[PDB]
Amino acid sequence: SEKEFVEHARKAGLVIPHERLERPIHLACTAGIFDAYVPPEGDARISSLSKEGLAQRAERLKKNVASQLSIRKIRESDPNFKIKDFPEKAKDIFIEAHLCLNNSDHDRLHTLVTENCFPDMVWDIRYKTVRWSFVESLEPPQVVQVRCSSLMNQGNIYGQVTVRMHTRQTLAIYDRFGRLMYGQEDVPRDVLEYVVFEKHLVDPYGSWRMHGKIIPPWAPPKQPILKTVMIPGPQLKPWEEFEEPQ
Amino acid sequence: AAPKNRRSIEVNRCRRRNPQKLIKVKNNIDVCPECGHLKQKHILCGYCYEKVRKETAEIRRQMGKQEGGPFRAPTTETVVLYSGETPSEQDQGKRIIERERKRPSWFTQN
Amino acid sequence: ISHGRVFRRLGLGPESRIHLLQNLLTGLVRHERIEASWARVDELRGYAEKLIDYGKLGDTNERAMRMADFWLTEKDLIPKLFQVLAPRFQGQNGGYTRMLQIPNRNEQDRAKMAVIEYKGNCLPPLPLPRRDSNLTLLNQLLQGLRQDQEASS
RNA sequence: CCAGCCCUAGAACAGGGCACA
RNA sequence: GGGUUUACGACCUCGAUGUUGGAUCAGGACACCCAAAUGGUGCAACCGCUAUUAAAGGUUCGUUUGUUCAACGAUUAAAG
RNA sequence: CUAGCCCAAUACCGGACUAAUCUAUUGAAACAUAGAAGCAAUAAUGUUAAUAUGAGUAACAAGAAGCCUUUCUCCUCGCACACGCUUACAUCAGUAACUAAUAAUAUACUGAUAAUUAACAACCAAUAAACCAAAACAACACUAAAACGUUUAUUAAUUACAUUGUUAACCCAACACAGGAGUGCACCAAGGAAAGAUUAAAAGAAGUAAAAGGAACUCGGCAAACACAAACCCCGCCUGUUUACCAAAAACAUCACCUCUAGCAUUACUAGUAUUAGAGGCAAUGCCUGCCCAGUGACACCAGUUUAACGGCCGCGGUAUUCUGACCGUGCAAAGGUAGCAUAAUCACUUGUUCUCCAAAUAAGGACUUGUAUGAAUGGCCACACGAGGGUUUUACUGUCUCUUACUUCCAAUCAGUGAAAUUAACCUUCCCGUGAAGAGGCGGGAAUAAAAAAAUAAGACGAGAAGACCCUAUGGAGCU
RNA sequence: GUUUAAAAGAACCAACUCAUCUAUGUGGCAAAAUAGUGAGAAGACUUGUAGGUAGAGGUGAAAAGCCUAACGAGCCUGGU
RNA sequence: UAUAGAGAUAGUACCGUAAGGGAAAGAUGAAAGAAUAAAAUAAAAGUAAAAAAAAGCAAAGAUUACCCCUUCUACCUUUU
RNA sequence: ACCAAAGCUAGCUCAACAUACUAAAC
Ligand SMILES: Nc1nc2c(ncn2[C@@H]2O[C@H](COP(=O)(O)O)[C@@H](O)[C@H]2O)c(=O)[nH]1
Ligand SMILES: *C(=O)[C@H](CCSC)NC=O
Ligand SMILES: [Mg+2]
Ligand SMILES: [Mg+2]
Ligand SMILES: [Mg+2]
Ligand SMILES: [Mg+2]
Ligand SMILES: [Mg+2]
Ligand SMILES: [Mg+2]
Ligand SMILES: [Mg+2]
Ligand SMILES: [Mg+2]
Ligand SMILES: [Mg+2]
Ligand SMILES: [Mg+2]
Ligand SMILES: [Mg+2]
Ligand SMILES: [Mg+2]
Ligand SMILES: [Mg+2]
Ligand SMILES: [Mg+2]
Ligand SMILES: [Mg+2]
Ligand SMILES: [Mg+2]
Ligand SMILES: [Mg+2]
Ligand SMILES: [Mg+2]
Ligand SMILES: [Mg+2]
Ligand SMILES: [Mg+2]
Ligand SMILES: [Mg+2]
Ligand SMILES: [Mg+2]
Ligand SMILES: [Mg+2]
Ligand SMILES: [Mg+2]
Ligand SMILES: [Mg+2]
Ligand SMILES: [Mg+2]
Ligand SMILES: [Mg+2]
Ligand SMILES: [Mg+2]
Ligand SMILES: [Mg+2]
Ligand SMILES: [Mg+2]
Ligand SMILES: [Mg+2]
Ligand SMILES: [Mg+2]
Ligand SMILES: [Mg+2]
Ligand SMILES: [Mg+2]
Ligand SMILES: [Mg+2]
Ligand SMILES: [Mg+2]
Ligand SMILES: [Mg+2]
Ligand SMILES: [Mg+2]
Ligand SMILES: [Mg+2]
Ligand SMILES: [Mg+2]
Ligand SMILES: [Mg+2]
Ligand SMILES: [Mg+2]
Ligand SMILES: [Mg+2]
Ligand SMILES: [Mg+2]
Ligand SMILES: [Mg+2]
Ligand SMILES: [Mg+2]
Ligand SMILES: [Mg+2]
Ligand SMILES: [Mg+2]
Ligand SMILES: [Mg+2]
Ligand SMILES: [Mg+2]
Ligand SMILES: [Mg+2]
Ligand SMILES: [Mg+2]
Ligand SMILES: [Mg+2]
Ligand SMILES: [Mg+2]
Ligand SMILES: [Mg+2]
Ligand SMILES: [Mg+2]
Ligand SMILES: [Mg+2]
Ligand SMILES: [Mg+2]
Ligand SMILES: [Mg+2]
Ligand SMILES: [Mg+2]
Ligand SMILES: [Mg+2]
Ligand SMILES: [Mg+2]
Ligand SMILES: [Mg+2]
Ligand SMILES: [Mg+2]
Ligand SMILES: [Mg+2]
Ligand SMILES: [Mg+2]
Ligand SMILES: [Mg+2]
Ligand SMILES: [Mg+2]
Numbered sequence A: 001s002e003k004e005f006v007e008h009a010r011k012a013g014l015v016i017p018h019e020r021l022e023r024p025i026h027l028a029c030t031a032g033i034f035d036a037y038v039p040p041e042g043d044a045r046i047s048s049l050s051k052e053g054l055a056q057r058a059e060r061l062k063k064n065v066a067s068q069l070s071i072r073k074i075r076e077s078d079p080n081f082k083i084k085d086f087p088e089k090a091k092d093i094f095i096e097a098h099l100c101l102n103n104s105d106h107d108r109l110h111t112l113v114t115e116n117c118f119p120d121m122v123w124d125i126r127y128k129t130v131r132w133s134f135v136e137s138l139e140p141p142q143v144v145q146v147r148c149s150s151l152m153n154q155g156n157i158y159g160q161v162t163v164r165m166h167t168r169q170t171l172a173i174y175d176r177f178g179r180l181m182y183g184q185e186d187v188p189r190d191v192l193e194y195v196v197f198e199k200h201l202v203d204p205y206g207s208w209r210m211h212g213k214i215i216p217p218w219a220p221p222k223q224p225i226l227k228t229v230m231i232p233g234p235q236l237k238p239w240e241e242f243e244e245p246q
Numbered sequence B: 001a002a003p004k005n006r007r008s009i010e011v012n013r014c015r016r017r018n019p020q021k022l023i024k025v026k027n028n029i030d031v032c033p034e035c036g037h038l039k040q041k042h043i044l045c046g047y048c049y050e051k052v053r054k055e056t057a058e059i060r061r062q063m064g065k066q067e068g069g070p071f072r073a074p075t076t077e078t079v080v081l082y083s084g085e086t087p088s089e090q091d092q093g094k095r096i097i098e099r100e101r102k103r104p105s106w107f108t109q110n
Numbered sequence C: 001i002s003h004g005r006v007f008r009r010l011g012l013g014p015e016s017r018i019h020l021l022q023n024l025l026t027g028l029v030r031h032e033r034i035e036a037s038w039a040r041v042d043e044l045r046g047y048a049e050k051l052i053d054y055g056k057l058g059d060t061n062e063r064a065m066r067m068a069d070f071w072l073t074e075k076d077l078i079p080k081l082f083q084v085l086a087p088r089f090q091g092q093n094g095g096y097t098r099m100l101q102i103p104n105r106n107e108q109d110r111a112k113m114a115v116i117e118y119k120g121n122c123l124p125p126l127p128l129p130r131r132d133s134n135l136t137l138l139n140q141l142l143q144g145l146r147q148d149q150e151a152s153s
Numbered sequence D: 001c002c003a004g005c006c007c008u009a010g011a012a013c014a015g016g017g018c019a020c021a
Numbered sequence E: 001g002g003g004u005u006u007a008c009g010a011c012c013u014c015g016a017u018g019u020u021g022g023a024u025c026a027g028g029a030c031a032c033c034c035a036a037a038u039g040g041u042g043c044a045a046c047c048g049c050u051a052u053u054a055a056a057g058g059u060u061c062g063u064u065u066g067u068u069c070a071a072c073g074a075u076u077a078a079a080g
Numbered sequence F: 001c002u003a004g005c006c007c008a009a010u011a012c013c014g015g016a017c018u019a020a021u022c023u024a025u026u027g028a029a030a031c032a033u034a035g036a037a038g039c040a041a042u043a044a045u046g047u048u049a050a051u052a053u054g055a056g057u058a059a060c061a062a063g064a065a066g067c068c069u070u071u072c073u074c075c076u077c078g079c080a081c082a083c084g085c086u087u088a089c090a091u092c093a094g095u096a097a098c099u100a101a102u103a104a105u106a107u108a109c110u111g112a113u114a115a116u117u118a119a120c121a122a123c124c125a126a127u128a129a130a131c132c133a134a135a136a137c138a139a140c141a142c143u144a145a146a147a148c149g150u151u152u153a154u155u156a157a158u159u160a161c162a163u164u165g166u167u168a169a170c171c172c173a174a175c176a177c178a179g180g181a182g183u184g185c186a187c188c189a190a191g192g193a194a195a196g197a198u199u200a201a202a203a204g205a206a207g208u209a210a211a212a213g214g215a216a217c218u219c220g221g222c223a224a225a226c227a228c229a230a231a232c233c234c235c236g237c238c239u240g241u242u243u244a245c246c247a248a249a250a251a252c253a254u255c256a257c258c259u260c261u262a263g264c265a266u267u268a269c270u271a272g273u274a275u276u277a278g279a280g281g282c283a284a285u286g287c288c289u290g291c292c293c294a295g296u297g298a299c300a301c302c303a304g305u306u307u308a309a310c311g312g313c314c315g316c317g318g319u320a321u322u323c324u325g326a327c328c329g330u331g332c333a334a335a336g337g338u339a340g341c342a343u344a345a346u347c348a349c350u351u352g353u354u355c356u357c358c359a360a361a362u363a364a365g366g367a368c369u370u371g372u373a374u375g376a377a378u379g380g381c382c383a384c385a386c387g388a389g390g391g392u393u394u395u396a397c398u399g400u401c402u403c404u405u406a407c408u409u410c411c412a413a414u415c416a417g418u419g420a421a422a423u424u425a426a427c428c429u430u431c432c433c434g435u436g437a438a439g440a441g442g443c444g445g446g447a448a449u450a451a452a453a454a455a456a457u458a459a460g461a462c463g464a465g466a467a468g469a470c471c472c473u474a475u476g477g478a479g480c481u
Numbered sequence G: 001g002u003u004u005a006a007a008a009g010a011a012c013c014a015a016c017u018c019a020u021c022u023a024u025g026u027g028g029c030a031a032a033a034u035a036g037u038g039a040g041a042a043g044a045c046u047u048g049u050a051g052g053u054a055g056a057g058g059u060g061a062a063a064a065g066c067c068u069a070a071c072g073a074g075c076c077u078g079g080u
Numbered sequence H: 001u002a003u004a005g006a007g008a009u010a011g012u013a014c015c016g017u018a019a020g021g022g023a024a025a026g027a028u029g030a031a032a033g034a035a036u037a038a039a040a041u042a043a044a045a046g047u048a049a050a051a052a053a054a055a056g057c058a059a060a061g062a063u064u065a066c067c068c069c070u071u072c073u074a075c076c077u078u079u080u
Numbered sequence I: 001a002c003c004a005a006a007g008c009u010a011g012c013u014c015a016a017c018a019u020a021c022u023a024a025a026c
């Protein structure tokens, strides 16, 4: 007669069991971006001409002292590190990561992108179908800036490299029922992004992993969705009156 | 008396699925033209009545705070005014309750 | 067989029903608007009308005085009944109360509930059910019929 | 036609009334 | 010929078919007590005695007794 | 006839195969040959666990409004201690679910934190002597002879603060149970709420009222009543005790009266001593208790004595015209039933006969009385008082009844929440006649027959409940003599 | 409390103790209760605490009663 | 191999005043410091998906066709 | 589709040997 129920699922963590951990948390990456590169508002008009863009890009890459000392730090920490063959590897990593997210290959996707890039690109898409492809690239990827974050508590250095890409992709996100949701699979839309890769320099392996994706604030808005959206108003209690904002 | 045999699921279903035991649909449901909530055509609106009841409870709370006793009822009429209002020539000589809230849109001055 | 019965059985008997109605009438006189069960309010409405009539009978009437003394349990409401409720009901004949069925009680009993209110009180007006305007299709058709009947005379 | 409200109609469901006033 | 009494038999029930009288409600048979239609009489009349047909409807209230019965009081068209 | 694998079955008997396991050798998309067994479940009112039917049925709960804990309507088992339970107590927070037989939330669930502080209570001198003289307002007394104390002498470590019980809405009854519970205070100044919300069907429970009659009802005046009185018998003298849980009595005990058994000392009887103490009978009191020691007991160890010890107290025939038999003959006994009462609580006949009571009586009371089976301490006859004992009358009273009715409350029906029980082979679960393990829903011959709810009545399901308690059987028991 | 020269195994009637009769209840509030009505109520009276008598027995104002909800003889264990 | 094997997760909860009796209850993964957690059965009885339409031990012969037609007195035990 | 279902382990049983037989905590 005396019986009760069990399995009341509750998640309650405290600072005492958080800090009495025997081994610290090994992080293969940092939280976010330390020094975000703010691009000039004239990219849309300088990307039209080849020489006037590449010249300014090389000037910005060579004249900044912070980027130069960071490249020197990466060079002294790991040999055979050159910036000339870096954009090709960055483009390869980008295309293979997008193909891995297309094929739903979470293992190779984890090997390619880092722990800050994986959730932001798998969470809202794990229940959908993607048809992404690579057709053309008008402007080759260009290394904009290079930064390095050194924390002396553990003695760990993370080298981040920002690469501006002008890419031409075909994106089509389908629904879990099979209907088209976002865009067509044949329209080669032009995208401009700034991929921030990161690498742990103290690590013996130290693979290059995509860390962040910067979009300029003046970038054109994304393509409209196919369906319509209703935005609800403030759900009013009986003893509350609506206030019309003007 | 005790049952002679076990009633089968067939007869049990025939008994407790008869339309006499099913929940009947209501056709007197309408929307309230004021707040848009659902109500019956012969019953007051729950939302509007809750608004009026909250306002009435606040008014009664203030009018009871005005009278420091349980057996202290006014022998004159009463008038409730809101922030930014003054007693008229017809409302003078009565008890006055003053609310800091602005006058609601449904409360008519009269 | 309950043919020709006008009072419903309430409480623990006739005296208990009288006491329940007396408490309800005291509350109604005090607050000018109360809410209770639909049956109890429907039973109390007639007593409220008769109480307003007895209050209109005057202050110096010993019958009305003792009736108010019996019914109004809180003795501070008898001057109220005789100097607020009765004077403000002078041109009216029988339209003293307003009873409206409110939704069922949110408690588990789901009782059929009503609200009773003395007309002309200092409280927010209940959301009374208003009829349709004359600008409705059917009402405009009936207005046209009425105008035709007026012109035909 | 049957929301509601009354009933000399009724356990529930049914049934009779709701314009004179 | 019937299966109302007592008996006879021991066929169904002893992992239960509860046993007399009453109260309530009665269903049915007729081998009819009354009521209805007749025959015979040693049927004068009133009362009777038998027999035939008919079962839609009735068939009382009390004292004693646990009583079914039984005795008694008052009646009823009769108290089957 | 055409093909075959070429002739039914209960108890018992025989044979050939065989499911699933383990082992020894094969096999390795799960098998073969052998050897072993905890070797096969449609049935034991079978065991365990889970599920259905009954059934969303029986049943269960929170007074009202309100400014939200403030005022109204009612009923009154409250405070403390002892005993007992141990934190269920207090503050804060939460309740989706678990406890409250439902919610609201919370003294009854969950978690954290706190608490009951000694002056009240517990533990808190011995050794000898003086001590007969009750408590009951105790002045003074009665019988049943009655707890409760000081003083004197010898030793009693001697020096602040020791230890322990301090909450509660509580205990014993499987339960937050209409039950059982010691003591001192008061009857409210303290405790609480009969209704979750409607309607006002039947039936059921409780109450109030009722024309005329007033027991005509019924086993009975049971119950009820505006009555709450007077008498007659039976049985027990009376008060009292008894079958906890179907019998409270006429049963037991009882004062009184009778029998037996004992001449006596350190644990009963008894710290008593025949006017005493035990083992018993019968029942106050009044009149009495008649005969018998033949048998069986007990004293006497054989005679003999004992019945207020166990127990018994007679036939057959004729007689005073015609009915009885004062009387006689004969026989057996230990004596042959005395007084009294008597159709009784007394075998049957019996509803014996008669008088009173009633209009009517197998009722009650008074008489007659062989009761051939009454009867005298296993006691017989009357009497006062007494009895929730068993019967009978007289008024009074009334719904007991003629002959029921009206209205309230709990029930009831609907709505909302929670939610059992006996029972159940499966049912797609009609009626009549017949038949049949001898009373049919299931068979036969006929009639009837859209399907499902809800509310009522109990004729049947040889309805449920309890392996009939009556009867019999058992080479089954047990109590008593 | 009342009546009594009375604390009289007297009387009326409370607390209290029993349980006469009826009606509900009958898997119920309850493995014996509720309501009304009853009997005793200064005594052979009720009752608190603590101890004793233990089953071939105890105790018994004999009902073959009671001895931890089933007693013509408790319950548990073992024989089993 | 968790209704088995010791009663045993334990002589513990719980039931009795006591002696004494005496249980049931475990199942992921290398990692849950992999619960926007991943895969195999979705196979008992009981329900839902999906209440029922004359007639009858509920089936069989069948049939274009679920019933409608025709035929068969549930099973064990105990008994003549 | 709910209710549910399946693990292989905890451990037990019977013997042999055996120090020689009321474990640990006290
Ligand atoms: N003694 C005896 N009993 C028989 C014989 N045959 C049948 N029975 C009994 O009859 C019963 C079964 O009836 P049956 O199956 O023979 O009709 C069983 O009790 C069985 O023992 C017989 O030949 N001799
Ligand atoms: C007699 O017929 C019997 C009585 C037994 S009571 C001693 N009744 C039923 O079996
Ligand atoms: Mg109509
Ligand atoms: Mg016969
Ligand atoms: Mg014969
Ligand atoms: Mg026989
Ligand atoms: Mg024979
Ligand atoms: Mg029998
Ligand atoms: Mg049977
Ligand atoms: Mg008849
Ligand atoms: Mg005839
Ligand atoms: Mg005639
Ligand atoms: Mg007849
Ligand atoms: Mg042949
Ligand atoms: Mg054969
Ligand atoms: Mg084999
Ligand atoms: Mg076996
Ligand atoms: Mg099985
Ligand atoms: Mg049974
Ligand atoms: Mg059964
Ligand atoms: Mg079985
Ligand atoms: Mg159910
Ligand atoms: Mg319900
Ligand atoms: Mg039912
Ligand atoms: Mg009910
Ligand atoms: Mg306890
Ligand atoms: Mg609850
Ligand atoms: Mg708590
Ligand atoms: Mg206390
Ligand atoms: Mg009510
Ligand atoms: Mg209540
Ligand atoms: Mg209620
Ligand atoms: Mg009724
Ligand atoms: Mg009645
Ligand atoms: Mg009366
Ligand atoms: Mg009368
Ligand atoms: Mg009579
Ligand atoms: Mg009679
Ligand atoms: Mg009486
Ligand atoms: Mg009397
Ligand atoms: Mg009298
Ligand atoms: Mg006596
Ligand atoms: Mg005397
Ligand atoms: Mg005694
Ligand atoms: Mg008894
Ligand atoms: Mg007793
Ligand atoms: Mg009795
Ligand atoms: Mg008595
Ligand atoms: Mg005697
Ligand atoms: Mg003498
Ligand atoms: Mg005697
Ligand atoms: Mg005598
Ligand atoms: Mg003698
Ligand atoms: Mg002798
Ligand atoms: Mg001799
Ligand atoms: Mg005489
Ligand atoms: Mg006799
Ligand atoms: Mg009589
Ligand atoms: Mg004799
Ligand atoms: Mg004698
Ligand atoms: Mg003698
Ligand atoms: Mg008497
Ligand atoms: Mg007595
Ligand atoms: Mg008596
Ligand atoms: Mg009437
Ligand atoms: Mg049928
Ligand atoms: Mg047969
Ligand atoms: Mg048979
Ligand atoms: Mg038949
Ligand atoms: Mg047939």
Ligand SMILES: [Mg+2]
Residues within 6 Å of the ligand: none
């Ligand atoms: Mg037939």
Ligand SMILES: [Mg+2]
Residues within 6 Å of the ligand: F446
């Ligand atoms: Mg025919």
Ligand SMILES: [Mg+2]
Residues within 6 Å of the ligand: F458
């Ligand atoms: Mg029946």
Ligand SMILES: [Mg+2]
Residues within 6 Å of the ligand: none
């Ligand atoms: Mg019934």
Ligand SMILES: [Mg+2]
Residues within 6 Å of the ligand: none
């Ligand atoms: Mg049958």
Ligand SMILES: [Mg+2]
Residues within 6 Å of the ligand: F462
């Ligand atoms: Mg029967």
Ligand SMILES: [Mg+2]
Residues within 6 Å of the ligand: none
């Ligand atoms: Mg039966």
Ligand SMILES: [Mg+2]
Residues within 6 Å of the ligand: F467
């Ligand atoms: Mg038997």
Ligand SMILES: [Mg+2]
Residues within 6 Å of the ligand: F468, F469, F470
């Ligand atoms: Mg019996």
Ligand SMILES: [Mg+2]
Residues within 6 Å of the ligand: none
């Ligand atoms: Mg016998």
Ligand SMILES: [Mg+2]
Residues within 6 Å of the ligand: F475
């Ligand atoms: Mg034999």
Ligand SMILES: [Mg+2]
Residues within 6 Å of the ligand: none
């Ligand atoms: Mg033997």
Ligand SMILES: [Mg+2]
Residues within 6 Å of the ligand: none
């Ligand atoms: Mg006395």
Ligand SMILES: [Mg+2]
Residues within 6 Å of the ligand: none
């Ligand atoms: Mg009583």
Ligand SMILES: [Mg+2]
Residues within 6 Å of the ligand: none
């Ligand atoms: Mg009464």
Ligand SMILES: [Mg+2]
Residues within 6 Å of the ligand: none
């Ligand atoms: Mg009393």
